[PDB]
Design a protein around this nucleic acid. Structure first.
Lengths: 129, 157, 205, 123, 82, 54, 80
RNA sequence: UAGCUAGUAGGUGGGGUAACGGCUCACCUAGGCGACGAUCCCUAGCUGGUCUGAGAGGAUGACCAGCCACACUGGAACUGA
RNA sequence: CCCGCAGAAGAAGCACCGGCUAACUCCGUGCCAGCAGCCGCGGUAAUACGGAGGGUGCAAGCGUUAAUCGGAAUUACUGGGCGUAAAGCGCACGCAGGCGGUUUGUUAAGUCAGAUGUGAAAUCCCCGGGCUCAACCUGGGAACUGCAUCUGAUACUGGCAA
């Protein structure tokens, strides 16, 4: 009964890219804002914005290349039934480095590559190809 | 030069009023050796007629694929009807290690180093379709750089 | 522990000259290399991919005279060593002492060079060395000792070896009957018509 | 297949059942021939097969095939059974080692003599 | 007594004694406390195997060890030649 | 289960026996079924020696 | 600082002693999940003061009975 | 194999041990364990490791080394560090 | 270990050859004798049985059996399914359990980072060394993915307070 809002967000992005929607919308939270920020920094979505005041909504502008969608596959890793925490030399690469693994580290939510450069691990939220 | 490899000749039947009618179906791959591979399924009443039909069908519908010196770009998964092929780049010096029809696909496509497994069914038509599905779905650092709006070193640094 | 049967049977099963008789007479006058040995030699087999891998591995075995326990251990060491596994296996095979004596020229064949090694007529670095599987390092000076330096087959072998193609990862003398192993032979130095990828693909199975 | 369900009860290592249970995980077992006789195989074959009721040293009375062409076996002979089921015979799961204790090798044989105990013809 | 003795390893007719400190009542090749060096009696010329960490051996004799005769001989040798 | 006929045979062997299976006619040691050489269907799709196609 | 385990009293019915559940949070060695395993401990409740539904700090000590080598050092969060 | 346990669980005090202690006796308390598997049945020496496997695992634990137990079977103390 | 002597002199078997699986013909026998790991072969032209010739593989070994892992993603954590192939309890409520919308503060348990102690030696792996080479022996490292303590981070999960 809506116990993983992060996977609901990734599902909304995946369904929007499958249905060729130009922008998706969802309820917002600070973790969703941080994941949208790391996706916008890595160039998978166009932009993102928050709308409400006391019931804030997150609007993500999906990105499409010359024929198709930019986000090829997006998978939730640390589901609430099984949380997954990896050390700084067990941070995996996704698509051998061409994708990113969003890693909630101890000093913020960032990519696997930024976590491996800074030298700390943490929870691994999702894989993006 | 378009090298080509026959994979599986098979004898199929069709029961009619008189008796059975046996006909031969052939499955071939055709590749250039630099990132262009296609496959072709021919069917006729004689084996060389099926071979020529399969070669002329494989020569037309070739796909393109971007790959390394002899290697895949990243571990990919190709799925068709029955088969669940996993392919993965290897170090330089190891041969193509796959099974049967996948060995023929990765021979003629120009791949030289791959660790590859076939899960599920291992019918040759389905593993060839799964292998070419995985090769067509493999994406390159430069095309993902164009997809994400940055450079190759911006991805890899 | 050696083959010691008819050698042209081996080379005609391979369908190519394995340089394992001599060079003094053309092999298509010595035998018929185009056929296969035996009663059904003129009939040709369709040779599935296991047959291709096996024929390639057996050809590189019977070229150097190595048997299968030793050749599998050569594969194990080659896959252990860093880098390209096939060219590692080829450099390991080319670093054998009997091959090195042949490749310098103190022997008509690998078998003659193996008998000359095993009959204590070869010193590397001033110690007489008896084992044919001695891995010869770079900067090793393999020398024929004076007890067998005045031997006729050595002189004839140097003449026909000068008719053969001279290798480049070693220097010969031929006036002192010795030679220095310069470097480890890389793949694009030795004979560029064997497929080591077939051997490593065979042993991967 | 849910991880909580696996935690409450795990995946089961299925079955370890042997086809040669009277060998008792030993390669050969000797035994005395209770009865040497000839039985008949299954549907598509129709031959006459020479088997024997043997009583092993662990007390098991089993039926063992006799390979080769012709033997010397009778009542009260001490043979060495080997393991390996002959397929078309009903309930014959073992084999006699020809060339063992009280079982002579096959006569006149000149190929695959090692499997039948025939010594090399010293011509 | 915690004696500093030799534990013989190596091949047949090619011995190699780890200079080691152990309880005196254990086996020769048994339960040791630490190994304080080694000694190769058939070693080579200029590829020499005989090593002792004399700070740890001095720590152990200050603790109350009883050196064996061969180990004490090698301590004499490496002290006079080192 | 043992058959009703065999139970009647056992009762009549306990009660003053005769062991009628001795008076049964002895079968040969081989099998006496009908042996037929194969048909053209069976020989035509027997698929022996499995030689590949060219 | 000395090592002290923080647990919850299960029962206190004996005399001068309690039984304390100490929940440990362990990864499963096979399935990866963080499961909630609980160890119980006979603890020497000195002065017989602790109730039956409260939290306690406990250090291990000299063996005091057939069981019960642990003792209460201080109480946090007394029961309702 | 679903209930098991009265020195049983705890206390106080005497004894006892090199040493804490139901280790043991007297009294009092009525506890203690168990679905996170007590109890009962079958099997088994344990580990570093070995084999295999891409790994995760699986099977195993002969040689070598660390630890335990036993010394025809059952029991007991003596001597001594 | 080195040197001397005589002479090619004293020293090659074992399995397989229908497909899987590398390598085929002839003779014998005729659902017999027999083979067989699976599919199966033998009924008069058997590349499947027995022998010969030839060949293929391994080689002072080679085969068979027993046992184990693999292939088996065929107990699936990595890494499987459940309309009809095997598999949604007949249905609901609900305790233990498992999971938890959103904001701030706190804690720092889980988590992550650094250090410390420990993780016996040998084995395993890497770079070397010694036995003529190898096996073997051996130096130094890495490893022992663990546990415990200390000091930090606190995003995420947990506890607390609103």
């Amino acid at each position: 009964s809506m116990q993983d809002p992060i996977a609901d967000m990734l599902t909304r992005i995946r369904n929007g890219q499958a249905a060729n929607k130009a922008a998706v919308t969802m309820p917002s939270s600070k973790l969703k804002v941080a994941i949208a920020n790391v996706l916008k920094e890595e160039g998978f979505i166009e932009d993102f914005k928050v709308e409400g005041d006391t019931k804030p909504e997150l609007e993500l502008t999906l990105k499409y290349f010359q024929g198709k969608a930019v986000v090829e596959s997006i998978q939730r890793v640390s589901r609430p039934g099984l949380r997954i925490y990896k050390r700084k030399d067990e941070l995996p690469k996704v698509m051998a480095g061409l994708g990113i693994a969003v890693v909630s580290t101890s000093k913020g939510v960032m990519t696997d590559r930024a976590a491996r450069q800074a030298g700390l691990g943490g929870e691994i939220i999702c894989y993006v190809a | 030069e378009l090298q080509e490899k026959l994979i599986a000749v098979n004898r199929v039947s069709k029961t009619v009023k008189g008796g059975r009618i046996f006909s031969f179906t052939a499955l071939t791959v055709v590749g250039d050796g630099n990132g262009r591979v296609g496959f072709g399924y021919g069917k006729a009443r004689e084996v060389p007629a099926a071979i020529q039909k399969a070669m002329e069908k494989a020569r037309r519908n070739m796909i393109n694929v971007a790959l390394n010196n002899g290697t895949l770009q990243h571990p990919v998964k190709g799925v068709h009807t029955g088969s669940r092929v996993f392919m993965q780049p290897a170090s330089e010096g190891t041969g193509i290690i796959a099974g049967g029809a996948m060995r023929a696909v990765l021979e003629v496509a120009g791949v030289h180093n791959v660790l590859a497994k076939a899960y599920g069914s291992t019918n040759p038509i389905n593993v060839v379709r799964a292998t070419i599905d995985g090769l067509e779905n493999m994406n390159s650092p430069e095309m993902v750089a164009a997809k994400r709006g940055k450079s190759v070193e911006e991805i890899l640094g | 522990a050696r083959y010691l049967g008819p050698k042209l049977k081996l080379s005609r099963r391979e369908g190519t000259d394995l340089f394992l008789k001599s060079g003094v007479r053309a092999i298509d006058t010595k035998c018929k290399i185009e056929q296969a040995p035996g009663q059904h030699g003129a009939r040709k087999p369709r040779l599935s991919d296991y047959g291709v891998q096996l024929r390639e591995k057996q050809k590189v075995r019977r070229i150097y005279g190595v048997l299968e326990r030793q050749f599998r251990n050569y594969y194990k060491e080659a896959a252990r060593l860093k880098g390209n596994t096939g060219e590692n296996l080829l450099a390991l095979l080319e670093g054998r002492l009997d091959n090195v004596v042949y490749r310098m020229g103190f022997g008509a064949t690998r078998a003659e060079a193996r008998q000359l090694v095993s009959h204590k007529a070869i010193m590397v670095n001033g110690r007489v060395v008896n084992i044919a599987s001695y891995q010869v390092s770079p900067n090793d000076v393999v020398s024929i000792r004076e007890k067998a330096k005045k031997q006729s087959r050595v002189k004839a072998a140097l003449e026909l070896a000068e008719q053969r193609e001279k290798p480049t990862w070693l220097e010969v003398d031929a006036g002192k009957m010795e030679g220095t192993f310069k470097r480890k032979p890389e793949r694009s130095d030795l004979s560029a018509d064997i497929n080591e990828h077939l051997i490593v693909e065979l042993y991967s199975k | 297949a849910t991880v909580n369900q696996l935690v409450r009860k795990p995946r089961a290592r299925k079955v370890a059942k042997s086809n040669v249970p009277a060998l008792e995980a030993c390669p050969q077992k000797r035994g005395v021939c209770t009865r040497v006789y000839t039985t008949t195989p299954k549907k598509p074959n129709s031959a006459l097969r020479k088997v024997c009721r043997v009583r092993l040293t662990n007390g098991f009375e089993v039926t063992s095939y006799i390979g080769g062409e012709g033997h010397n076996l009778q009542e009260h002979s001490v043979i060495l059974i080997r393991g390996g089921r002959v397929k078309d015979l009903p309930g014959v799961r073992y084999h006699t080692v020809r060339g063992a204790l009280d079982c002579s090798g096959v006569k006149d044989r000149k190929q695959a003599r090692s499997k039948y105990g025939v010594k090399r013809p010293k011509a | 007594m915690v004696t500093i003795r030799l534990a013989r390893h190596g091949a047949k007719k090619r011995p190699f004694y780890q200079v080691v400190v152990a309880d005196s009542r254990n086996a020769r090749n048994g339960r040791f406390i630490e190994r304080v060096g080694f000694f190769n009696p058939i070693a080579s010329e200029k590829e020499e195997g005989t090593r002792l960490d004399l700070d740890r051996i001095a720590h152990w004799v200050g603790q109350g060890a009883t050196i064996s005769d061969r180990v004490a001989a090698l301590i004499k040798e490496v002290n006079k030649a080192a | 289960a043992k058959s009703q006929a065999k139970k009647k045979r056992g009762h009549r062997l306990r009660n003053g026996g005769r062991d009628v299976l001795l008076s049964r006619g002895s079968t040969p040691s081989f099998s006496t079924h009908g042996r037929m050489t194969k048909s053209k269907k069976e020989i035509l799709n027997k698929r022996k020696h499995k030689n590949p196609y060219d | 600082k000395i090592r002290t385990l923080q647990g919850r009293v299960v029962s206190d019915k004996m005399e001068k002693s309690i039984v304390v559940a100490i929940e440990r949070f362990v990864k499963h060695p096979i399935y990866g999940k963080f499961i909630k395993r609980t160890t119980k401990l006979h603890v020497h409740d000195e002065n017989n003061e602790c109730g039956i539904g409260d939290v306690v700090e406990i250090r291990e000590c000299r063996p005091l009975s057939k069981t019960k080598s642990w003792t209460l050092v201080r109480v946090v969060e007394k029961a309702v």
